[model samples]
Target: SHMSFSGKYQLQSQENFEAFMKAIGLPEELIQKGKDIKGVSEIVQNGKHFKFTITAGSKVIQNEFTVGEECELETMTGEKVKTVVQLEGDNKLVTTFKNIKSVTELNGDIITNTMTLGDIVFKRISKRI
Candidate 1:
């Protein structure tokens, strides 16, 4: 069966969040606060176009873009980054911001978002809600 990327997902687990955030230059206080917060991501997909809304703690990050086109997206730290997102096969959304590369893959009802910076890898697993 084919899987769709349009859905609301709640973060269930994470790995290396602190290390990765540090590498990205997030402030120490924000890192400490974000470490234990469970985030939620909602994706609205229309063919190659997508809208993403991510909520963490009291902050929200939102962005809209089409695959293969360059656009500005808001980062978790509220920084706007200009990047192009790519679709890998059919289930993965790949992009890079501030030299940090991210790959978000969907499998069944689970979505795993992995961000890589230097040797630090932050992975978050989310389940449909």
Candidate 2:
């Protein structure tokens, strides 16, 4: 149950990201810019406390919460979502929002993050920085 996810990661690639955003009802401008920019994520974990920082262009977002606790999360289009996140198994972090569900898996130096809206799943790949 020892999974290391404490590092900075830079976006490398994505699949169906626009479609997923569209399905979740993101604005057209946001969806277009979201797919055009590269985002960086910095994750720090200590016991049950976790801090996640995501940055794209000039927009920076940070969230801090304990596992299985409810908190406010911002979507890509600047919408706020109230959610409870939990760790599944040792490496996967799962959270569900009213608009979308996201699962992030930590594997070595790469993190595979997926977002689901209805039947659409968007995959984003990031590598350690």
Candidate 3:
């Protein structure tokens, strides 16, 4: 069987969400609000292109991108960043700096996000909801 990632997912658990926020220069007040709220991520992919629609509370953000291309992305904090995304095989998604380095992996029923800021690494997990 091969890994497939195309669904709506909700946050299940997180590690260092606040710390990672601060490390990336997010405001103190925003970090707390973001940490306390759980979010949903809807992902649709087709070969080398992807569409991500993320929602938290009453806010929604949508982004579309293709592999190997650089584009502007809006962060959860409403910050814009230049980034490039790439797929490594069928299970891993690697992205260039969008204020931080991030790698997303899909294994069976879970999608895990490993985000890094210098030496600080935070993990966020999502499950079908």
Candidate 4:
């Protein structure tokens, strides 16, 4: 039988989140803290001009520049996640990820795009076929 790439995964409890993260090698602390708030709440597909609101203790975070810059991502759990980058003609593309820790350009052979396991599984199914 075949498997679908996108599907719904609802984890209402902390335990469920931990298990899901652990299956992908994410450290316990990282998983819990990230969920405590929406810090790493991934924003996908939306373009650069997409308006985002971030409030820090009654202060809203501003996003003007670097809204479309591409970068390598490294989480505290040592999860070296590549990206869903779309390169325009001159190395310019928009990215919605805001939890980007570290970024670097790929040398010809030093990089391979690999999405994390949890992301591949714990997502809402987006197709009918």
Best prediction by lDDT: 1
Q: Assess each prediction's global lDDT (C-alpha) against the native.
A: 0.86, 0.82, 0.79, 0.32
Residue-level lDDT for 5 in candidate 4: 17
Which digits, one per residue and each the tens of the lDDT, describe model 4 over residues 1-129? 221112112222222335545665666666656544422111122333222222211123333222344434443344444544443342233232334312211222221122234244222111111
- Cα lDDT of model 2 by residue, 1-129, tens digit: 678679999999888967876776667777676676777889999988889997743367888878898888876667887889999999999998886788999888999998887788888899999
Best by TM-score: 1
Per-candidate RMSD, Å: 1.7, 1.9, 2.3, 12.6
Report the lDDT of model 3 for residue 32: 64
Which residue pairs show backbone clashes in model 1?
none
Provide the TM-score for each candidate, comma-separated. Answer: 0.91, 0.87, 0.85, 0.29
Predictions ranked by lDDT, top down? 1, 2, 3, 4
TM-score of 3: 0.85
User: Runs in model 2 with CA error above 4 Å?
Assistant: 56-58
Each prediction's number of clashing residue pairs? 0, 0, 0, 4
- Ranking of all candidate structures by their TM-score, best first: 1, 2, 3, 4
Clashing pairs in 2: none
Deviation in Å, model 2, residue 6 alpha carbon: 0.8
Per-residue C-alpha lDDT of model 3 across residues 56-88, encoded as one tens digit per residue: 434588988887899778876678888888888
